[PDB]
Design a protein around this ligand. Structure first.
Ligand code: HEM
Length: 391
């Protein structure tokens, strides 16, 4: 293959396509691809008209970018239609774009406060946090997922190109997960995090609409405002890993901080695969699965704890080198739940003081409400929020 050194890699994955219409936005129960980008913005709109145009315009960009197609530049004296990163024919590359609104959007600016989702709130500092003020909150989060980082970056460029007057980017975190070798005829396997552990084994069934309806998605008739039906609460946490320290920790200690076997992801009390679960009823004292191990604290597997299940959808992030010359990398923790208080906050409240904290440090993120989907291309994300607020 007389391939030139700068030839672009070729991949059949570029034409994969996820629909952006539905009862829900894509990117929540959609299978997580190899590349991710979570960006936070402040809305610069000064009124309900400009906020409507922002919602209409984001929708328009989502429809094109996630489905792809030709991009014609109108005239040489004008800026080009887009950045051109994906060529004159934009490829979707399995891109999903998920829109979520922060607590701060429901201030006095737009007259939405009286229909704010009832668990929506500003993220507050947990005891092991070292929050960078510049990495927290935002009027609007946008989660981009695609097969390769250039597709999310291209989507980011396009949105900022078309809304530089209504959006200011505040902070962003890109991330990835390591793909595994194909192997048809084997159970699918959970991606690893940068601590080298399988990450997602005990997620609830993302392919089970009944399970998602009671764990992830807001339901119509409930204590929530009716417009918010089909949305979800989104918790984002930028979590440093002190990796050099971790890599100097004995394997057996890594396994009892996490409470799973490292190479397999199996329970520490038996079972071969990562789909097995420990039996805490058998082990009340934590002699197989430590009481203070990460999983056992995150989910003690009591009947009461089934109210605190969450859907994790993380990426791994690599940001550079610190001043003591250590790798600036960690977890881009993203999680969805029908109830933010019973979910992420309760779980993190259980996790405070866990031994893992010796190796991790949340530095940023915030809480957002992922908006309901649209089934009608005449419709647009955020519309029901504007109408509900309009009584
Ligand atoms: C960088 C920090 C973290 C790492 C490396 C990490 C890693 C892991 C690993 C390896 C598992 C076991 C496999 C699995 O069931 O998915 C797990 C489980 C879990 N993690 Fe985390 N995690 C981190 C932070 C968090 C945080 C902040 C939460 C807060 C909500 C959380 C919630 C959970 C839950 C609910 C489970 C499932 C426990 C179970 O049902 O057995 N994790 N985590």
């Amino acid at each position: 293959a007389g391939t030139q050194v700068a030839d672009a890699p070729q991949s059949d994955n570029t034409q994969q396509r996820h629909d952006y219409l539905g009862a829900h936005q894509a990117g929540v129960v959609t299978p997580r691809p190899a590349a991710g980008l979570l960006a936070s913005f402040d809305v610069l709109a000064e009124d309900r008209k400009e906020l409507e145009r922002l919602f209409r315009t984001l929708t328009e960009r989502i429809a094109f970018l996630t489905q792809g197609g030709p991009q014609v530049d109108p005239d040489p004296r004008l800026p080009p239609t887009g950045s051109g990163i994906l060529g004159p024919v934009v490829t979707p590359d399995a891109l999903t774009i998920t829109l979520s609104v922060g607590d701060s959007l429901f201030d006095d600016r737009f007259g939405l406060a009286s229909v704010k989702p009832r668990h929506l709130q500003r993220m507050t500092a947990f005891p092991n946090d070292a929050l960078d003020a510049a990495l927290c909150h935002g009027d609007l989060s946008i989660q981009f997922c695609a097969n390769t980082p250039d597709t999310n970056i291209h989507a980011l460029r396009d949105i900022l190109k078309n809304l530089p007057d209504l959006l200011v980017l505040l902070w962003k975190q890109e991330g990835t997960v390591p793909p595994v070798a194909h192997k048809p005829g084997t159970p699918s396997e959970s991606a690893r995090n940068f601590l080298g552990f399988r990450d997602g084994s005990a997620n609830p069934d993302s392919a089970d609409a009944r399970e998602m309806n009671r764990i992830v998605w807001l339901q119509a008739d409930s204590a929530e405002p009716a417009w918010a039906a089909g949305g979800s609460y989104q918790a984002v946490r930028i979590i440093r890993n002190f990796v050099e320290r971790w890599d100097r920790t004995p394997l057996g200690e890594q396994e009892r901080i996490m409470g799973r076997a490292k190479p397999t992801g199996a329970p520490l009390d038996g079972g071969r695969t990562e789909h097995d679960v420990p039996d805490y009823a058998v082990d009340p004292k934590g002699t197989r699965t430590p009481l203070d191990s990460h999983i056992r604290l995150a989910n003690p597997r009591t009947s009461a704890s089934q109210a605190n299940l969450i859907l994790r959808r993380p990426f791994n992030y690599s940001n550079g080198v610190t001043k003591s010359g250590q790798l600036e990398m960690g977890l881009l923790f993203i999680a969805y739940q029908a109830d933010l208080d019973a979910g992420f906050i309760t779980v993190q409240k259980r996790l405070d003081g866990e031994p893992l904290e010796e190796y991790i440090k949340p530095i940023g993120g915030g809480y957002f409400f992922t908006l309901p989907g649209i089934t009608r291309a005449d419709d647009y994300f955020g519309r029901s929020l504007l109408d509900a607020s309009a009584r």
